[PDB]
Design a protein around this ligand. Sequence first.
Ligand SMILES: NC(=O)C1=CN([C@@H]2O[C@H](COP(=O)(O)OP(=O)(O)OC[C@H]3O[C@@H](n4cnc5c(N)ncnc54)[C@H](OP(=O)(O)O)[C@@H]3O)[C@@H](O)[C@H]2O)C=CC1
Ligand SMILES: NC(=O)C1=CN([C@@H]2O[C@H](COP(=O)(O)OP(=O)(O)OC[C@H]3O[C@@H](n4cnc5c(N)ncnc54)[C@H](OP(=O)(O)O)[C@@H]3O)[C@@H](O)[C@H]2O)C=CC1
Lengths: 390, 375
Amino acid sequence: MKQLTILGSTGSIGNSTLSVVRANPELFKVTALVAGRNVREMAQQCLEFSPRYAAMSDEHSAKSLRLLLAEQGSDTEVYSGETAACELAALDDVDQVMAAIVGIAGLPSTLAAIRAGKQVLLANKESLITCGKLFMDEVKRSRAQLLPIDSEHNAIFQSLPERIQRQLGYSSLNENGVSRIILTGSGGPFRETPLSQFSDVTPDQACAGRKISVDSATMMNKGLEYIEARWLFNASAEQIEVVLHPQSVIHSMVRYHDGSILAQMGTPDMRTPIAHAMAYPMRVSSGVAPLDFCKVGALTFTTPDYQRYPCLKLAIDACNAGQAATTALNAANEISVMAFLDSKIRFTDIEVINRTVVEGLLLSEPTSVEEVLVIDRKARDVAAQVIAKL
Amino acid sequence: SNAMKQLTILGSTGSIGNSTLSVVRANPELFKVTALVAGRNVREMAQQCLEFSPRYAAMSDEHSAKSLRLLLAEQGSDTEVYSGETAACELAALDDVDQVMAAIVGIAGLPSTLAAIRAGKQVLLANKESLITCGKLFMDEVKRSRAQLLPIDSEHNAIFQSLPERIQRQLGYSSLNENGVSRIILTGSGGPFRVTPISVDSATMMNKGLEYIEARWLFNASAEQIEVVLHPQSVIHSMVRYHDGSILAQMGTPDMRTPIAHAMAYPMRVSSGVAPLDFCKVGALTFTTPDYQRYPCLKLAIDACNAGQAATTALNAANEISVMAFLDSKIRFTDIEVINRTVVEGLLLSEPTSVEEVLVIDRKARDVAAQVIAK
Ligand SMILES: NC(=O)C1=CN([C@@H]2O[C@H](COP(=O)(O)OP(=O)(O)OC[C@H]3O[C@@H](n4cnc5c(N)ncnc54)[C@H](OP(=O)(O)O)[C@@H]3O)[C@@H](O)[C@H]2O)C=CC1
Ligand SMILES: NC(=O)C1=CN([C@@H]2O[C@H](COP(=O)(O)OP(=O)(O)OC[C@H]3O[C@@H](n4cnc5c(N)ncnc54)[C@H](OP(=O)(O)O)[C@@H]3O)[C@@H](O)[C@H]2O)C=CC1
């Protein structure tokens, strides 16, 4: 049966993943567990799932965890640091690796797994927003099998032909029958709000994560998912479109050459795409009532409008210009968001900041993690500046 | 192209037949026409023969096959003409032909369609009666000759596309349940009255029940693994539920060249001039379960399917008579289910075990429904 390393096990995706394991003890076996500094959640996982190894980001968290398990007499071996996380993402006997360590701290361990030809269930985003090129190159080299976990990408993946699914990110969409990918998204809260009221939007009105809420209103969440999808499904600009779909019943679609469209639907539960990806090409259960069609309201769709969602276009143009542009935009969006979250700026200022930073770009494309981290820090700064200067 | 597939097209003068030739027109490097077969439309076949330069061509009788060979000669055609059921079946079984479009209408379509299956071909299945009349035998032949069955009806084509490749490649003799599939969702508009004089069948929703029957056999489904669901707008063409909550659906426009080109290119895809769906032009999309009181026939379709081919074979045949009558201002729209149920439950039957046997039940039930009408 199947052997797992779970990178980022103590957090939200980490735990849904373990839940799929808890409900299919016969199919999935936990070999390695990695997390940051949550000893307590890590110990209780290590006792329940009895891995061979575990790692924490630093030595102090390791020492703690090592003691707690030593009191319970578990055999689990405990390590620390980026190298250990990399070596647990690369063990020869592990079949499947969950890359669910958030943010740019996650990239190293994700890459090791990609490098070891593993089935990698990709939860980390930055990977592709900032250095999709390096990652997808590595994927080709290793014939590593990527499986997206985000519901939208997962939707696409299920909607894609097996042919492409098994060669994810280096199959040629056109040759294999695909005309276009349809990334769907709701519009956020301000979808039928009159543009006059955009300038006056506030944090409480946006958020009632905190930051994901803002992104979904500007549709930065969908711009970034668009970039992710270009690298991920090996898709050019003409091969992917975005449609608005307020009810979010349909998680995404795929257009084929004869006209056929294949879409995935479901409720929005975590486990469902996580287990799709874990069992693939099998399938298992997970609790949640199947969708009911008498319950769901009507479904509607629109093309998004760039006057309402300028950030989207921005994301698209940034992709077309390169990894420097996206890296920059991502980082400057993180600054803009938590600036509007502190009321330093208006909601409509987010585009302007995001745009200025990106149109003052004059760097080379990054060819590693390292060069990314540089661009990420400088864009932050420039953005940081831009906030102040109005 | 060296990847040219060769086609035999049976029913090539009808609407499905013509839709099939359009898809060949758009991709003249990937589909070669080797045999065209039709009924009595001598003119239409002559054009297609001339347009497409087949090797062979057949019609249902020799008078038809005579006139067409004169029209072939005057234009100077190499196309060898035959007639009769035996010619059709041999054309449907040629060695170098890869694909066979089985688009003859009515019970007449069975011999040729069975030939194709028995010859192991990739069979593009239009004919409803095949699966409706003899599900058992046809799937038994599909199993044994390993033909690739490719449903052309939109609903069924929707479902094929929403299923795992593993079921697709083994269509009919594979296990849904072991391939992650929990249920198949047959969708349909539910007709205008969702009555004064294909129109009626979709009204009483027999068209749907019959599609139901077809779908149980096609996909190897128990009644448990199939749910019917109304979807007025007909944008989603049908769906599949997976064990993990996932649902897959196919959508598109009413243009039939979409599923026919899916079928022809399988496992690959081709363009076919179809205007792709536009979500700006689709309004809201709604879903309600069916009302068996509003569609008595649906419930009847189910019961018939659970009883066996004898019963379902009965129903179809009954309905043909029962409908034709309503439209000839002879009985009332509301009667159609009552006639049809009376018939199906009035016969003492044996499960058929050949086309021949099947056909006798078709005549019998027809005669009976006629009598019930007199009353
Ligand atoms: N939440 C969601 O619905 C979705 C999330 N994602 C992505 O999945 C990833 C995980 O998201 P989520 O589960 O919400 O994240 P959480 O913040 O819940 O957890 C992050 C996990 O990563 C661990 N971690 C952080 N830094 C390090 C490090 N240096 N070394 C080892 N472990 C580390 C944290 O450990 P600890 O807490 O023990 O320190 C924690 O276990 C993210 O990249 C996110 O974008 C993608 C799609 C959907
Ligand atoms: N149209 C649709 O939307 C759909 C149709 N189908 C089914 O597919 C089949 C074909 O439909 P469609 O093409 O519209 O039907 P049509 O009524 O247009 O024509 C049927 C074809 O069969 C031919 N034909 C009839 N009897 C014979 C015979 N004894 N030998 C040879 N050819 C014969 C006719 O030839 P000629 O006219 O030259 O005599 C004609 O080309 C039917 O079973 C139909 O129910 C399935 C799904 C959708």
